[PDB]
Design an enzyme around this catalytic site. Structure first.
Site, mmCIF file in Angstrom:
data_model
loop_
_atom_site.group_PDB
_atom_site.id
_atom_site.type_symbol
_atom_site.label_atom_id
_atom_site.label_comp_id
_atom_site.label_asym_id
_atom_site.label_seq_id
_atom_site.Cartn_x
_atom_site.Cartn_y
_atom_site.Cartn_z
ATOM 1 N N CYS A 1 64.342 -22.684 29.144
ATOM 2 C CA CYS A 1 62.931 -22.395 29.303
ATOM 3 C C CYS A 1 62.385 -21.727 28.049
ATOM 4 O O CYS A 1 63.078 -20.971 27.345
ATOM 5 C CB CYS A 1 62.698 -21.524 30.556
ATOM 6 S SG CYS A 1 62.910 -22.543 32.021
ATOM 7 N N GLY B 1 68.774 -21.957 30.690
ATOM 8 C CA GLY B 1 68.486 -21.282 29.441
ATOM 9 C C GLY B 1 67.497 -21.980 28.530
ATOM 10 O O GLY B 1 67.211 -21.463 27.442
ATOM 11 N N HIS C 1 58.449 -16.045 33.937
ATOM 12 C CA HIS C 1 59.562 -15.740 34.827
ATOM 13 C C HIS C 1 60.722 -15.052 34.111
ATOM 14 O O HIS C 1 61.732 -14.729 34.762
ATOM 15 C CB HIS C 1 60.031 -16.981 35.622
ATOM 16 C CG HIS C 1 60.709 -18.043 34.818
ATOM 17 N ND1 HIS C 1 60.086 -19.213 34.443
ATOM 18 C CD2 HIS C 1 61.990 -18.146 34.395
ATOM 19 C CE1 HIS C 1 60.947 -19.979 33.788
ATOM 20 N NE2 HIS C 1 62.107 -19.344 33.731
HETATM 21 C C1 LIG Z 1 64.532 -22.025 32.653
HETATM 22 O O1 LIG Z 1 65.529 -22.008 31.644
HETATM 23 C C2 LIG Z 1 64.972 -22.986 33.774
HETATM 24 C C3 LIG Z 1 65.112 -24.413 33.214
HETATM 25 C C4 LIG Z 1 65.649 -25.438 34.225
HETATM 26 C C5 LIG Z 1 67.030 -25.005 34.715
HETATM 27 C C6 LIG Z 1 67.905 -26.273 34.854
HETATM 28 N N1 LIG Z 1 67.239 -27.307 34.038
HETATM 29 C C7 LIG Z 1 65.973 -26.861 33.677
HETATM 30 O O2 LIG Z 1 65.187 -27.490 32.999
HETATM 31 N N2 LIG Z 1 64.022 -22.922 34.856
HETATM 32 C C8 LIG Z 1 64.349 -22.675 36.157
HETATM 33 O O3 LIG Z 1 65.517 -22.501 36.503
HETATM 34 C C9 LIG Z 1 63.278 -22.627 37.252
HETATM 35 C C10 LIG Z 1 62.786 -21.133 37.402
HETATM 36 C C11 LIG Z 1 61.487 -20.980 38.226
HETATM 37 C C12 LIG Z 1 61.173 -19.513 38.645
HETATM 38 C C13 LIG Z 1 60.270 -21.625 37.503
HETATM 39 N N3 LIG Z 1 63.801 -23.188 38.488
HETATM 40 C C14 LIG Z 1 64.313 -24.468 38.531
HETATM 41 O O4 LIG Z 1 64.201 -25.204 37.540
HETATM 42 O O5 LIG Z 1 64.970 -24.972 39.629
HETATM 43 C C15 LIG Z 1 65.686 -26.244 39.540
HETATM 44 C C16 LIG Z 1 66.087 -26.914 40.904
HETATM 45 C C17 LIG Z 1 65.848 -28.392 41.221
HETATM 46 C C18 LIG Z 1 64.920 -27.362 41.850
HETATM 47 C C19 LIG Z 1 64.989 -27.029 43.341
HETATM 48 C C20 LIG Z 1 63.862 -26.156 43.920
HETATM 49 C C21 LIG Z 1 63.010 -25.423 42.869
#
Ligand SMILES: *C(=O)[C@H](C[C@@H]1CCNC1=O)NC(=O)[C@H](CC(C)C)NC(=O)OC[C@@H]1C[C@H]1CCC
Ligand SMILES: *C(=O)[C@H](C[C@@H]1CCNC1=O)NC(=O)[C@H](CC(C)C)NC(=O)OC[C@@H]1C[C@H]1CCC
Lengths: 302, 302
Positions: free
Chosen positions: A146, A144, A43
């Site tokens: 990921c 950040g 992603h």
């Molecule tokens: C990547 O850095 C990030 C890590 C994530 C953000 C906040 N704490 C974490 O561990 N990943 C994402 O933001 C991820 C991206 C998708 C395209 C895989 N989305 C996500 O984590 O969403 C978080 C919120 C709770 C969920 C609601 C519906 C998905």
């Protein structure tokens, strides 16, 4: 009396030397640089407007090598790119001179691994988690993070098992194995997803009760016993994992002289309630320490 | 709902590069190699027959430079030796090329630091502890772990605060600061020693209750309030530390809109009992997370 148990992580230096920053388009996260390959979540290719339903195949087609900027905190020139499941494999023109001996493996529910939490390619903290029965981890990850990695170590060989992808609605976390699969039924799309029920990890509760005995705390041990087959029937109706004994558990039974079946009975009784008593300072069952943890931290046995 | 809190340690690579093995006589433990100096516990000089009442001054006099064998896993030739409190300072002929930017500081009760547990000069695990009000830590240390180090990090500067010395009868651990003092009233002799009472670290309990609010868990918040002066009188009679607010706690009060005095009242009530309710999955107060932990792990604020 202190149990002598702590949440113990592997020393992180070998893995720190493998972390890089990956930037593509408007996205920046972490990658893992081994030999001539940089692994990162796919992603990184996604625009923000498309995180809920990315078309990863078309995004991949739209990228060139020059689309990916890889930096160590050096610039690594990307000379190839490919997608494996939910991960990208970027080929770079410089082999990491600090590549450790390593393998890729998948971690199983109830097993522990170490995580190196990184932001912008910079390691910031380390912690240990157990993979839950619903294929989440109870981690500590912010925007950040990921591409942060989880791993175990056997000898000098680092076994990478986890690359961080997302947070779930209940605050837990999940990610990918290095074969590109997500753990569990999860998808790397920013939409709400079903979450399977968590369960108590029976083998880890047994380990902790052995840890209690090894620390002089055995009030819950009785001659009464429950068989593994009977416990496992019970477990299914009570949100416990089915118990599968191991040589690590057997060493704890030998050292303490308490049989596994005695502690399976104890678990059944303790689940109904501790009746005001404590075990190693807790009034609820603990399933976040493994038999290996107890053997290593208390008995000095790796 | 998962709190997003874990026991988080600093990445350990910078410190791993400083660990060596020190052997003198019949004893082997770990040392810390910075610039041209190797620090280690002075009981490396002790024969086993004398661990309960060593005469360290006479042992020091009896040693020559050649008495000390220092190895990195290289042999480092010792060209000077001196004693500072409960530590030796060995001067070696090679400056560590991997010496980080560093300082020496003393850690205070309730503050967290990272530990690198080492055996035979080899790093084996890392974990984080809070210095208890009785100047012990609830660690995980076995025979051979002495000389393992604890540290905090500010920027790129490593602040070494702890060198491991001993286990107490109740299973907790203590050690030295790099000024050579032992923490608390402890002595580096293998005899039973008085142990001061432990206490709940009030400022850390307040942090954890703020962590609960930040996670949507605020049933224990009422308009009722207790002043810091009144809480601190109460604390003295109830095995709590006196509360001293900080800017880190103030940021949590701002972010949540809940005043410190509201949570001091809550603590007083919760100490009498949780009445079957849970806070962040616990039925007892938690004092092992600091205000800084909560600010960093949940709010992304260092
Ligand atoms: C990547 O850095 C990030 C890590 C994530 C953000 C906040 N704490 C974490 O561990 N990943 C994402 O933001 C991820 C991206 C998708 C395209 C895989 N989305 C996500 O984590 O969403 C978080 C919120 C709770 C969920 C609601 C519906 C998905
Ligand atoms: C140094 O490696 C060692 C570390 C200690 C051993 C077991 N777990 C640990 O953390 N330190 C010692 O053995 C220490 C040496 C003296 C001279 C400072 N003695 C010690 O720790 O004794 C432990 C037992 C419980 C106490 C009983 C009376 C002292």
């Amino acid at each position: 009396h202190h149990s002598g148990l702590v949440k113990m992580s592997h020393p992180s230096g070998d893995v720190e030397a493998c972390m890089v920053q990956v930037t593509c388009g408007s996205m920046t996260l972490n990658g893992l640089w081994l030999d001539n390959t940089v692994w990162c979540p796919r992603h990184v290719m996604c625009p923000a407007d498309q995180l809920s339903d990315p078309n990863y195949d078309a995004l991949l087609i739209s990228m060139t090598n020059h689309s990916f900027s890889v930096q160590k905190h050096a610039n690594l020139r990307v000379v190839g790119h490919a997608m494996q499941g939910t991960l990208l494999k970027l080929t770079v023109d410089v082999a990491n001179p600090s590549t450790p001996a390593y393998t890729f493996t998948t971690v199983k529910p109830g097993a522990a691994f170490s995580v190196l939490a990184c932001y912008n390619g910079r390691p910031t903290g380390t912690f240990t988690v157990v993979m839950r029965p619903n294929y989440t981890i109870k981690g500590s990850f912010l925007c950040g993070s990921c591409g942060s990695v989880g791993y175990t170590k056997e000898g000098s060989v680092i076994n990478f098992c986890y690359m961080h992808q997302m947070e779930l609605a209940n605050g837990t976390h999940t990610g990918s194995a290095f074969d590109g699969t997500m753990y569990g039924a999860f998808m790397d799309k920013q939409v709400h997803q079903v979450q399977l029920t968590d369960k108590y990890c029976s083998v880890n509760v047994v380990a902790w009760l052995y840890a209690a005995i090894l620390n002089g705390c055995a009030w819950f041990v009785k001659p009464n016993r429950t068989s593994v087959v009977s416990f496992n029937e019970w477990a299914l109706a009570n949100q416990f994992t089915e118990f599968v004994g191991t040589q690590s558990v057997d060493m704890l039974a030998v050292k303490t002289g308490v049989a596994i079946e005695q502690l399976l009975y104890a678990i059944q009784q303790l689940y109904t309630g501790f009746q005001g008593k404590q075990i190693l300072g807790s009034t609820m069952l603990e399933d976040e320490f493994t038999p290996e943890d107890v053997n290593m931290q208390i008995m000095g046995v790796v």
